[PDB]
């Protein structure tokens, strides 16, 4: 069929819809409340002790950065994927641990301070040295340098939005821990309201429900990536002589990856008419692994009660 661009197109209003800005600000507010309420149940002693012992941090970074990009490249080469799809899956693989994974860590309820220090150190390491590995692993694809194409202001903004609410929570609990219940209830109700609002808004904001036109093997590998990541993290944690409570959160952090930076780099690198359904690939992909995480949650409820 030679080489032709996809018929999918984005309206010009997509650049500056007020609804897009509303969606961005409500997600920022949601994440701020998530992080505040999530750090409201954390203490400084455990995070200091885990910072003193970067053993789990070291193994987490080794699994996420020294192995995950390599296996992502291997799967991309094996699946005979196109240049755009291979670049997208490589960027997803080299992406650091997503914030939502910490939420899933709350479901794990094991060594939460280790989880937060691991994810912040992973984001710092990403900001420090992601472009070099991205350029090394993308030989023959996108011959451009791409070094300046990766976002930097977004990474530091995310780092601030992670550190500030957690630090505020630790300070408030250490000094004056007397208003836990009201803050928790308000956070929960506002979180539910914002979730309902975003669920209502995104359905009409996305549009063009042609996400099923994607080729089957790309969907298969997008589903396999979180599974293989979780399996590799669990195996590395178990074979390295780590206790069970301290390994589930590390495995879940390693398996989950952020997709916002991948979306931003995909949109800045390529026009939206050139990209077909892959523009909707990351937003669904994380959702997919969320469901996968839910399955793991069931497995947890198959072990804690039994």
């Amino acid at each position, epitope marked *: 069929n*030679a080489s032709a661009p996809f018929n999918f197109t984005l309206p010009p209003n997509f650049g500056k819809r007020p609804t897009d800005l509303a969606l961005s600000v409500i997600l920022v507010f949601m994440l701020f409340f998530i992080m505040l309420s999530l750090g409201c149940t954390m203490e400084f002693s455990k995070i200091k002790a885990h910072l003193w012992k970067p053993k789990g941090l070291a193994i987490a970074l080794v699994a996420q950065y020294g192995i995950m990009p390599l296996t992502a490249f291997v799967l991309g080469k094996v699946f005979r994927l196109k*240049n755009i799809e*291979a*670049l997208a899956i490589l960027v997803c693989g080299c992406s650091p641990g997503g914030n939502l994974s910490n939420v899933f860590s709350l479901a794990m309820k094991g060594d939460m301070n280790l989880s937060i220090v691991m994810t912040t150190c992973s984001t710092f390491c990403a900001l420090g040295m992601m472009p070099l590995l991205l350029y090394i692993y993308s030989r023959g*694809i996108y011959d451009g340098d791409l070094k300046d194409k990766v976002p930097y202001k977004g990474i530091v903004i995310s780092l601030v939005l992670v550190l500030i609410p957690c630090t505020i929570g630790i300070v408030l609990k250490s000094k004056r821990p007397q208003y836990m219940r009201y803050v928790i209830k308000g956070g929960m109700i506002i979180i539910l309201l914002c979730s309902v609002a975003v669920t209502v808004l995104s359905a009409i904001n996305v549009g063009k429900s042609i996400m099923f036109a994607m080729t089957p093997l790309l969907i298969a590998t997008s589903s396999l990536m979180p599974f293989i990541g979780f399996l590799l993290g669990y195996v590395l944690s178990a074979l390295f002589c780590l206790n069970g409570r301290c390994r589930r959160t590390v495995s879940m952090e390693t398996g989950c990856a952020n997709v916002q930076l991948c979306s931003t780099i995909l949109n800045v690198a390529f*026009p939206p008419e050139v990209i077909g359904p892959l523009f909707f690939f990351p937003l669904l992909y994380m959702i997919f692994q969320l469901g996968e995480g839910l399955l793991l949650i069931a497995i947890f409820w198959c072990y804690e009660k039994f």
Partner: antibody
Amino acid sequence: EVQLQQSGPELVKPGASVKMSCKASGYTFTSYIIHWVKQKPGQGLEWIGYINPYNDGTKYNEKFKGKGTLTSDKSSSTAYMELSSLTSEDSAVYYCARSYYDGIPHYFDYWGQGTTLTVSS
Amino acid sequence: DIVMTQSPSSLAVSAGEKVTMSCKSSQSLFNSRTRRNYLAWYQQKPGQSPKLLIYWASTRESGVPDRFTGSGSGTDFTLTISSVQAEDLAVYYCKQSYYLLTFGAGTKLELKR
């Protein structure tokens, strides 16, 4: 279909300061990238470099890295190529070609009619 | 870098004599991940802009005569015309785009006397 229009024949002094414009308005100009090919009389084609207008990215050959310069105009949907360094031997024919670019330029499916650049006294 | 060298560089065919232009390139310009075999065969009539004939070295552009066939793999490629007409006299460069855009020396077609 789509056609590519060149600026036209150019006769310039060895004082440089020459610019070549290629126009193509038959599609979405940001969906494809534009290459420039230099041909000497009876010596075959020679590649110079390409430009992607969406990100305003430019890549040049090793020989043409020093002199080659590519710019794009989305409003005019045009590609401008400049050297700023010419010699008497530099006279040639320059073609602008349109190609798809996912990770690697595929092929030059459409070409312009060509611009004959001459440098002399 | 990759450089293209064409062995014959000049031949003459009257009506139906085999042509079989071949350029061996430099190394294996075959993508392992994507089975595309990056290569392009162009046609440049005198006093005219080059016209694309074959892309991916196996598939021909729509609208060209079926007499233009291209078969090859790895480093060995061959373009055959078979029934050569009076309008088929041009220059072919077998341009490659695996790593860098480089053009071949060019082969000229004439008429035997």
